mmCIF file with all atom_site columns, C-alpha atoms in Angstrom:
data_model
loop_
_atom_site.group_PDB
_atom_site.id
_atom_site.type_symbol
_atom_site.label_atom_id
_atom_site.label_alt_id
_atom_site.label_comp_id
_atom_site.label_asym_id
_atom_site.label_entity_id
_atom_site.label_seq_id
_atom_site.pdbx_PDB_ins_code
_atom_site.Cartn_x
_atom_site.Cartn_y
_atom_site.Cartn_z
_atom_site.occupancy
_atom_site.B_iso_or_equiv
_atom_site.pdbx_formal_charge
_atom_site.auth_seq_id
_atom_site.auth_comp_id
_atom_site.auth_asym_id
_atom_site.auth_atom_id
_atom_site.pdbx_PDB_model_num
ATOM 1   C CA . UNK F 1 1  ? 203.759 39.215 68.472  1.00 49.44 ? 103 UNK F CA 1
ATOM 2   C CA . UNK F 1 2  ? 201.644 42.594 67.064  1.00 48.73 ? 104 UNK F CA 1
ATOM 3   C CA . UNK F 1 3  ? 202.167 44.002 64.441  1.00 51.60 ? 105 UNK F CA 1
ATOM 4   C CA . UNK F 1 4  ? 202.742 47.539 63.949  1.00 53.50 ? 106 UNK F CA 1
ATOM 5   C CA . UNK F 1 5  ? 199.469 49.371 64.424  1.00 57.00 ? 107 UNK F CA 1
ATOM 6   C CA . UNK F 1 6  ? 199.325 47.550 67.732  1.00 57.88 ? 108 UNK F CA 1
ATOM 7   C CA . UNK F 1 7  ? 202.435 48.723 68.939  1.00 58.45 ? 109 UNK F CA 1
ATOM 8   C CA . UNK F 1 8  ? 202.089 51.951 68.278  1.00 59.57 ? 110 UNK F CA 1
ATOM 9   C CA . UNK F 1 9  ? 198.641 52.313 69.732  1.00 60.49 ? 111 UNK F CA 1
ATOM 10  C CA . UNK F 1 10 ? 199.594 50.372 72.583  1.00 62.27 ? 112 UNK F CA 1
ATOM 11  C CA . UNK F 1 11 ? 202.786 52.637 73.468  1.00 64.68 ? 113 UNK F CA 1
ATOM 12  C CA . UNK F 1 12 ? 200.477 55.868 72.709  1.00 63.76 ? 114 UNK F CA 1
ATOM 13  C CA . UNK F 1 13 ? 197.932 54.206 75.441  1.00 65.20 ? 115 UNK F CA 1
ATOM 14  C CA . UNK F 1 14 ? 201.091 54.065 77.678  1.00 67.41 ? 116 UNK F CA 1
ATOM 15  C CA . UNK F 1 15 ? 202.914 57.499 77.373  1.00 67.36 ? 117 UNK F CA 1
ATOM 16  C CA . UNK F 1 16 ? 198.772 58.768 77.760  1.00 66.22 ? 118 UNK F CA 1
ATOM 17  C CA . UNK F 1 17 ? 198.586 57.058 80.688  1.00 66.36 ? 119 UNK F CA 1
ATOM 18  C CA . UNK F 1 18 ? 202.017 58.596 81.842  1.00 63.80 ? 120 UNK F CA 1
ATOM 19  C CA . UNK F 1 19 ? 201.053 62.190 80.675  1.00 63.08 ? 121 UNK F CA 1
ATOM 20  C CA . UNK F 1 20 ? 198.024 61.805 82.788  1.00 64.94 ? 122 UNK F CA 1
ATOM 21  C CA . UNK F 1 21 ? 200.026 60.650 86.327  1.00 63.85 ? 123 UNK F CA 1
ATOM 22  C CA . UNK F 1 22 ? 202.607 64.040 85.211  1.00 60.80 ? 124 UNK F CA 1
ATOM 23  C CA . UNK F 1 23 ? 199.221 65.876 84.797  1.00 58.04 ? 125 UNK F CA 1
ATOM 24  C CA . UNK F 1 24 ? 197.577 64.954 88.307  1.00 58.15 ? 126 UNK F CA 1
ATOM 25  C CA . UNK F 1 25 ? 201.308 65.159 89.746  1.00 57.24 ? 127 UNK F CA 1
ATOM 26  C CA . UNK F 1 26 ? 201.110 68.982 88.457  1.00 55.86 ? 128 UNK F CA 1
ATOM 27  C CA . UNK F 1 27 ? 197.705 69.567 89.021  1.00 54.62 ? 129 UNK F CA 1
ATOM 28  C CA . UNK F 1 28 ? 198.578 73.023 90.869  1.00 55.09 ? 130 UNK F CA 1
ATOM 29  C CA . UNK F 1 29 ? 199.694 74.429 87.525  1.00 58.88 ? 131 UNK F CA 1
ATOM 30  C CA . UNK F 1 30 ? 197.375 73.369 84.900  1.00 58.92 ? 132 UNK F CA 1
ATOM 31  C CA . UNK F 1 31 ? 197.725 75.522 81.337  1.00 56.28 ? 133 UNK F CA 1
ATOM 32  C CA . UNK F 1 32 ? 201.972 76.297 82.934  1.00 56.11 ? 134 UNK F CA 1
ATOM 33  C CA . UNK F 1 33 ? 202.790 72.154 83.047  1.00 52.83 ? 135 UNK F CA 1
ATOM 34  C CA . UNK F 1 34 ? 205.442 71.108 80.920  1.00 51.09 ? 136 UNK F CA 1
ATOM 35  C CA . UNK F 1 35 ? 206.443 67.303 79.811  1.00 50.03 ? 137 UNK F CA 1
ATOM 36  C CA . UNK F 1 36 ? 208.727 65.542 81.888  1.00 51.91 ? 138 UNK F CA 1
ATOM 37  C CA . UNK F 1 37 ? 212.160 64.279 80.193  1.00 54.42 ? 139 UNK F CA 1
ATOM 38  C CA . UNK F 1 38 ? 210.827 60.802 80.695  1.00 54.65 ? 140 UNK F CA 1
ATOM 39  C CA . UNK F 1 39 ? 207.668 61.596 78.137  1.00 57.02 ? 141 UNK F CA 1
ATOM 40  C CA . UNK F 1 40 ? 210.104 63.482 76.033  1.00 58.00 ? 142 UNK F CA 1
ATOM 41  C CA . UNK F 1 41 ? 212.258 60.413 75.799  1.00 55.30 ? 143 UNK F CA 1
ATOM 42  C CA . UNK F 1 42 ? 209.313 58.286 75.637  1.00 58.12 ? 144 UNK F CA 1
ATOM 43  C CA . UNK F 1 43 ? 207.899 60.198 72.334  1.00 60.89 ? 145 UNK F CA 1
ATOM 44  C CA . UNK F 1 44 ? 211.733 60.628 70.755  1.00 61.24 ? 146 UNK F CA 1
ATOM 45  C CA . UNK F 1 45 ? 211.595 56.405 71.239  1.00 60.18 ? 147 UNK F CA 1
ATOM 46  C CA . UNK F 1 46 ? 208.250 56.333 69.586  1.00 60.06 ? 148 UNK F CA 1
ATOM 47  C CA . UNK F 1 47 ? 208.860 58.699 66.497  1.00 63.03 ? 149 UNK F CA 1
ATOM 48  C CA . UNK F 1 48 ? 212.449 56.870 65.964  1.00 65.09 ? 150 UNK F CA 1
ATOM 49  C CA . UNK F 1 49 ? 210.546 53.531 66.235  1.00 64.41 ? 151 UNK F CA 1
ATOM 50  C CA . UNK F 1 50 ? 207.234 53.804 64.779  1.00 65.60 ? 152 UNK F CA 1
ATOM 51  C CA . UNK F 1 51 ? 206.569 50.299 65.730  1.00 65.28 ? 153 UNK F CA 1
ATOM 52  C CA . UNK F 1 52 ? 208.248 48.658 63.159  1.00 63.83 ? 154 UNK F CA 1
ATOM 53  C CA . UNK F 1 53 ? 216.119 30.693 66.664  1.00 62.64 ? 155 UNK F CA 1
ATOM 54  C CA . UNK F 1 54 ? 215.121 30.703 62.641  1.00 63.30 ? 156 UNK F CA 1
ATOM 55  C CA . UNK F 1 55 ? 211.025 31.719 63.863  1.00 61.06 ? 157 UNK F CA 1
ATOM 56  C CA . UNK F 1 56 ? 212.575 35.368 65.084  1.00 62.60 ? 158 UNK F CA 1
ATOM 57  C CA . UNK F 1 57 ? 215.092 35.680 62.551  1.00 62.98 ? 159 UNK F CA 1
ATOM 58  C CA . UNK F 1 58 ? 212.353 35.336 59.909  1.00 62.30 ? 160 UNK F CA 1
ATOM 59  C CA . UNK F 1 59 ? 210.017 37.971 62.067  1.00 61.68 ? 161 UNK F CA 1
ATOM 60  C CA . UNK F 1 60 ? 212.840 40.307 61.845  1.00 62.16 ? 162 UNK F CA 1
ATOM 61  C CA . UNK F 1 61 ? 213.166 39.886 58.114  1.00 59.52 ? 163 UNK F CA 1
ATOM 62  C CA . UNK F 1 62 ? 209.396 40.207 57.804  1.00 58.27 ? 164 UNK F CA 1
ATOM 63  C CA . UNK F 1 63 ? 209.038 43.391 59.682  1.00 56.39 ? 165 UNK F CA 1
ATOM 64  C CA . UNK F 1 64 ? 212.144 44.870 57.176  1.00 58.10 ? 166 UNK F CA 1
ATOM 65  C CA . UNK F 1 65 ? 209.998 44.026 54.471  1.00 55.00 ? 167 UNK F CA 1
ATOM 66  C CA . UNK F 1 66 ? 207.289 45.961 56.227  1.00 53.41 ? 168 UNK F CA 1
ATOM 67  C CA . UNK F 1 67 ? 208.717 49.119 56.012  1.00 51.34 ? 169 UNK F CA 1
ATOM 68  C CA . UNK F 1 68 ? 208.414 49.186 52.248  1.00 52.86 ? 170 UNK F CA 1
ATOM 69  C CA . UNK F 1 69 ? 204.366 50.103 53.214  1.00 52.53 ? 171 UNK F CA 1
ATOM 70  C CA . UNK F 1 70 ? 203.615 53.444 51.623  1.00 53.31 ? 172 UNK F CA 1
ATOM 71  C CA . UNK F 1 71 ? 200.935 53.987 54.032  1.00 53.06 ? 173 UNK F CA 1
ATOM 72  C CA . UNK F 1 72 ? 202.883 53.300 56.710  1.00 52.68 ? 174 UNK F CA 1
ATOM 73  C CA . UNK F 1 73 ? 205.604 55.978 55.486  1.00 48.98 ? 175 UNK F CA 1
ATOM 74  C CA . UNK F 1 74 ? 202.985 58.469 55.085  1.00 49.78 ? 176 UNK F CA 1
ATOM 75  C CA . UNK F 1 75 ? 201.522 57.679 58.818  1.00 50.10 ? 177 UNK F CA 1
ATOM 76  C CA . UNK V 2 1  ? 185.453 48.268 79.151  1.00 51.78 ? 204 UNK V CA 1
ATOM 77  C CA . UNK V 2 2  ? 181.444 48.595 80.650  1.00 50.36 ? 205 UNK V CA 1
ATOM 78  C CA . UNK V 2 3  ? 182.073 52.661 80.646  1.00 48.07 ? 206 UNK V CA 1
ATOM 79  C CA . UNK V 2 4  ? 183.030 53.053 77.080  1.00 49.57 ? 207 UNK V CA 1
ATOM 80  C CA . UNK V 2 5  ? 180.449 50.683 75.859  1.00 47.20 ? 208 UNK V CA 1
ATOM 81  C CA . UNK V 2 6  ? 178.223 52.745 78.058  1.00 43.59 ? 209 UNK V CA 1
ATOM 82  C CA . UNK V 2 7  ? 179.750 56.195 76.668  1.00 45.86 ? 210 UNK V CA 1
ATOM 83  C CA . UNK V 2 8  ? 179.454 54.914 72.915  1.00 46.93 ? 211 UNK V CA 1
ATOM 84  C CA . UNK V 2 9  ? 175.977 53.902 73.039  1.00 49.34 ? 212 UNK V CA 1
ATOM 85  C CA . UNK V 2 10 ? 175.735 57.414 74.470  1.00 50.41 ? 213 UNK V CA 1
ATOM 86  C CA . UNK V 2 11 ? 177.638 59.066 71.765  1.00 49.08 ? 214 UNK V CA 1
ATOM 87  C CA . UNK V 2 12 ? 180.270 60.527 74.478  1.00 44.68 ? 215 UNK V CA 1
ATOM 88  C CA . UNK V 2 13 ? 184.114 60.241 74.972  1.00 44.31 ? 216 UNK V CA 1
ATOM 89  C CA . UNK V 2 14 ? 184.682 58.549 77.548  1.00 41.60 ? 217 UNK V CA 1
ATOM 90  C CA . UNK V 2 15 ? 187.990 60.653 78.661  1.00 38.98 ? 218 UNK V CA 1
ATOM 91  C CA . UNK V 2 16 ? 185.472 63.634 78.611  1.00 40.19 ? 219 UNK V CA 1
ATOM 92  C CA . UNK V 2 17 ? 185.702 64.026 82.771  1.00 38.40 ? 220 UNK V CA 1
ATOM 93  C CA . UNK V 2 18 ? 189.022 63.773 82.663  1.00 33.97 ? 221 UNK V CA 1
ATOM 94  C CA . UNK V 2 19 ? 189.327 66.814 80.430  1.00 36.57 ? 222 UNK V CA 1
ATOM 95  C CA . UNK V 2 20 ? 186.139 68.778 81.979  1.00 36.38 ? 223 UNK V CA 1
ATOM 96  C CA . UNK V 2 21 ? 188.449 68.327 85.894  1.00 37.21 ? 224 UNK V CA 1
ATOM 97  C CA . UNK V 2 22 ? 191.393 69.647 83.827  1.00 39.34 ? 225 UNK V CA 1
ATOM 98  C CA . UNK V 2 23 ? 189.488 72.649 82.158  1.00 36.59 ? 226 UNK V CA 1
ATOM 99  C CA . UNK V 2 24 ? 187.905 73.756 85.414  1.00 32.41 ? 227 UNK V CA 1
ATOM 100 C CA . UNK V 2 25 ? 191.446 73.719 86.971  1.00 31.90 ? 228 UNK V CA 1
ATOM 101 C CA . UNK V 2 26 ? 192.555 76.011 84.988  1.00 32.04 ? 229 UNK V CA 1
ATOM 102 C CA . UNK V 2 27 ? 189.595 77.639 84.925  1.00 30.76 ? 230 UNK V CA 1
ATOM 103 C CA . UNK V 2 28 ? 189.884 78.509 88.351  1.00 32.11 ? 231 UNK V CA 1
ATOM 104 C CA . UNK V 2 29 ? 193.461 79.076 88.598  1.00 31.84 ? 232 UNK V CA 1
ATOM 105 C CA . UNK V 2 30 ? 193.483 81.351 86.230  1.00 34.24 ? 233 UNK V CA 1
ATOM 106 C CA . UNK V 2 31 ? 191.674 83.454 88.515  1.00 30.57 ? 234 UNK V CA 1
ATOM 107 C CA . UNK V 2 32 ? 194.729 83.451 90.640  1.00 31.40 ? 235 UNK V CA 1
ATOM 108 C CA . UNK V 2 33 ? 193.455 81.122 92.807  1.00 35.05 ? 236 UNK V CA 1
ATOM 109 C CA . UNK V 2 34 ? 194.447 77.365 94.027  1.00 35.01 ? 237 UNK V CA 1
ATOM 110 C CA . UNK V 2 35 ? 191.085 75.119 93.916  1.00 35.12 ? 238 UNK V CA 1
ATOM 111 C CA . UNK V 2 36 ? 189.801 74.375 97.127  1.00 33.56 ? 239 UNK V CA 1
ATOM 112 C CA . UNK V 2 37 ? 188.443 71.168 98.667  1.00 33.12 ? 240 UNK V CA 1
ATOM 113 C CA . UNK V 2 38 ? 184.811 72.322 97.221  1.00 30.49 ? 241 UNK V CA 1
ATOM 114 C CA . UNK V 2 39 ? 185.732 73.075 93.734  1.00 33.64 ? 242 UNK V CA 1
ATOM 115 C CA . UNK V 2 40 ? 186.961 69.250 93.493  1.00 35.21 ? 243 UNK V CA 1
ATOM 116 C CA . UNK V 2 41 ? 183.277 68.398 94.926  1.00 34.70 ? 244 UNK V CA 1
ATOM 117 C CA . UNK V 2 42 ? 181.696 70.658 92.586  1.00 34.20 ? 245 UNK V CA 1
ATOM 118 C CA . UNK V 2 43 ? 183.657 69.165 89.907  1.00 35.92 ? 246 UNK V CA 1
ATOM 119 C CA . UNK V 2 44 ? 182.494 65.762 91.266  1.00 37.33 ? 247 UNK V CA 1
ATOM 120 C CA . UNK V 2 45 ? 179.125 66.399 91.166  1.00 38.92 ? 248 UNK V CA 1
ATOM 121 C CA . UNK V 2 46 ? 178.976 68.257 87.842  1.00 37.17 ? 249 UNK V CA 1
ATOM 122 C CA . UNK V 2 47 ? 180.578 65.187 86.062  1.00 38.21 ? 250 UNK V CA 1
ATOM 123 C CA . UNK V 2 48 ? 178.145 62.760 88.066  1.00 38.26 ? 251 UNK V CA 1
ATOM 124 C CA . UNK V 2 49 ? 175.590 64.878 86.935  1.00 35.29 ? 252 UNK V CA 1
ATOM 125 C CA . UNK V 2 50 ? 176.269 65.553 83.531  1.00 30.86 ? 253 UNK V CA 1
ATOM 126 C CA . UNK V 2 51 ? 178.258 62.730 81.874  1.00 28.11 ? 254 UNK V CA 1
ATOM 127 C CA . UNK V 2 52 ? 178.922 59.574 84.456  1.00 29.52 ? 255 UNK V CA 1
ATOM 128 C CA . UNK V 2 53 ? 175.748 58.587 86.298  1.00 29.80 ? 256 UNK V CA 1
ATOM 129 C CA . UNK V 2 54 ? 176.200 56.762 89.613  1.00 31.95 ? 257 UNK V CA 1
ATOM 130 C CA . UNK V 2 55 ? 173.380 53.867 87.421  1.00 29.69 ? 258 UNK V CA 1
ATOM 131 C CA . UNK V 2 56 ? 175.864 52.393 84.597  1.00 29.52 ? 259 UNK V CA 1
ATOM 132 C CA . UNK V 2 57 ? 177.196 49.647 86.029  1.00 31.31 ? 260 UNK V CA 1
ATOM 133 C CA . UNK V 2 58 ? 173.696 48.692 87.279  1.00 27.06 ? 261 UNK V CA 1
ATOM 134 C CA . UNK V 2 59 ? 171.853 49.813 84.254  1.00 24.15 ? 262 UNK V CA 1
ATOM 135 C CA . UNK V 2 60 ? 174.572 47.379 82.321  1.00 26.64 ? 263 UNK V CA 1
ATOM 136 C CA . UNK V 2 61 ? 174.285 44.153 85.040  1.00 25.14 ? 264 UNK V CA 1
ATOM 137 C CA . UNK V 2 62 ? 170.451 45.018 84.650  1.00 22.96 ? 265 UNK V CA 1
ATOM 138 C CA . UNK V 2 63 ? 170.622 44.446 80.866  1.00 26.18 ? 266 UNK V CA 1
ATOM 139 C CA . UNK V 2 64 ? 173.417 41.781 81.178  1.00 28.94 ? 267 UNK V CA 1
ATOM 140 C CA . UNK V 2 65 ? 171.257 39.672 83.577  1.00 30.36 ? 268 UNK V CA 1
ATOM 141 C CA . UNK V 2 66 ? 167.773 39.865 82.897  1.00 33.11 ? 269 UNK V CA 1
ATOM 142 C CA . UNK V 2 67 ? 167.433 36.542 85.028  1.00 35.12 ? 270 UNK V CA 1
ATOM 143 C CA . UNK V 2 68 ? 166.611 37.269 88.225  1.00 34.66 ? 271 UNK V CA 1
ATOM 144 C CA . UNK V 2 69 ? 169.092 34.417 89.729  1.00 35.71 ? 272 UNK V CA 1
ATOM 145 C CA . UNK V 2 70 ? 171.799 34.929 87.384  1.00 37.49 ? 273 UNK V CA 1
ATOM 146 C CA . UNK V 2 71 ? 171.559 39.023 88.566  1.00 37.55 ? 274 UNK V CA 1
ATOM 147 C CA . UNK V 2 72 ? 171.775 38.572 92.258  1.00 37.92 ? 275 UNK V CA 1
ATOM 148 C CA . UNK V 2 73 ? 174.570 35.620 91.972  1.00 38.37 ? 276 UNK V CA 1
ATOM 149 C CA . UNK V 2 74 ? 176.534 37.554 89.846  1.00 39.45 ? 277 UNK V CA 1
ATOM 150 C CA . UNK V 2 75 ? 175.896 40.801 92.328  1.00 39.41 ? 278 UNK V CA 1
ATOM 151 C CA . UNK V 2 76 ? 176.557 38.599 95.651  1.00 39.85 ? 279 UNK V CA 1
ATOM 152 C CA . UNK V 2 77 ? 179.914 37.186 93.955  1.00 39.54 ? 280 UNK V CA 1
ATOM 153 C CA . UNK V 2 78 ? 180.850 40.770 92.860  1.00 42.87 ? 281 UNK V CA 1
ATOM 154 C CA . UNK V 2 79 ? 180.022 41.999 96.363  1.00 44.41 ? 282 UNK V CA 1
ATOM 155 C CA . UNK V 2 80 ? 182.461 39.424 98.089  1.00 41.83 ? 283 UNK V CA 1
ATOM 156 C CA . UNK V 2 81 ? 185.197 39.732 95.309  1.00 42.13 ? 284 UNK V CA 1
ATOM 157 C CA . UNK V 2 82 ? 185.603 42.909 95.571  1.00 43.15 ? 285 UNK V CA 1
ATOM 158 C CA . UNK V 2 83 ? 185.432 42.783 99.462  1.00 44.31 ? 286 UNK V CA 1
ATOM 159 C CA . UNK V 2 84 ? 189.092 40.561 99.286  1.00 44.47 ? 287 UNK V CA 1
ATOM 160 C CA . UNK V 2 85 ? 190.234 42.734 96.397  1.00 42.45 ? 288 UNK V CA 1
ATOM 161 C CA . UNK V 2 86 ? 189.736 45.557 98.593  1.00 42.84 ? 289 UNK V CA 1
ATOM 162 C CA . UNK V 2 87 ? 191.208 44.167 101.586 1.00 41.05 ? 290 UNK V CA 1
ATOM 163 C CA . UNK V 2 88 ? 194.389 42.974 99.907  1.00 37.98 ? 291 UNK V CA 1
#
């Protein structure tokens, strides 16, 4: 599995990708088009989660030690 | 993956037509206007013009290939690829 970075590029790719089908979808209103409640949701997911049977309990314990990252607080 | 290589040894972003259609959307509608079938072909033809040549993916198979056998098998098997992937 990724690890952080990844996932959070990879989910930005996706809700760009999204934005973009909303965008073409409202292409009659360009400058008045507001987010959908799906890419609302999708970002509220994202900025709660910023990415962060022994092999998956040890991942999990890993990726709480992960948040300890400085950087990654600041990001 | 051929277009950004393409737009970075150019320098360009490669979402650049994206936002150039966008801008010249709203451009036009905010004239007060919808965009007619010949705006989008304007549009077209600027971005073919300015930032997307119709020669990339040749220009790139060109460099890719620069056996003459290895270019046209690779174009043939392209050619009937895409011909199912199209049909399906």
């Amino acid at each position: 599995r990724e690890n952080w970075h990844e996932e959070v590029l990879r989910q930005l790719q996706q809700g760009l990708a999204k934005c973009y089908s909303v965008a073409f979808e409202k292409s009659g209103a360009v400058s008045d088009a507001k987010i959908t409640p799906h890419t609302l949701n999708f970002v509220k997911k994202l900025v709660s989660t910023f990415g962060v049977s022994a092999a998956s309990e040890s991942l999990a314990r890993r990726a709480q030690a992960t948040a300890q990252d400085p950087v990654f607080q600041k990001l | 993956e051929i277009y950004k290589q393409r737009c970075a040894k150019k320098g360009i972003e490669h979402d650049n037509p994206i936002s150039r259609y966008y801008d010249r959307l709203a451009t036009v509608q905010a004239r007060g206007t919808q965009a007619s079938h010949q705006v989008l072909r304007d549009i077209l033809k600027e971005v073919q013009s300015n930032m997307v040549p119709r020669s990339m993916l040749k220009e790139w198979a060109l460099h890719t290939f620069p056996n003459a056998t290895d270019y046209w098998t690779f174009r043939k098997m392209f050619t009937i690829q895409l011909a199912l992937i199209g049909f399906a």
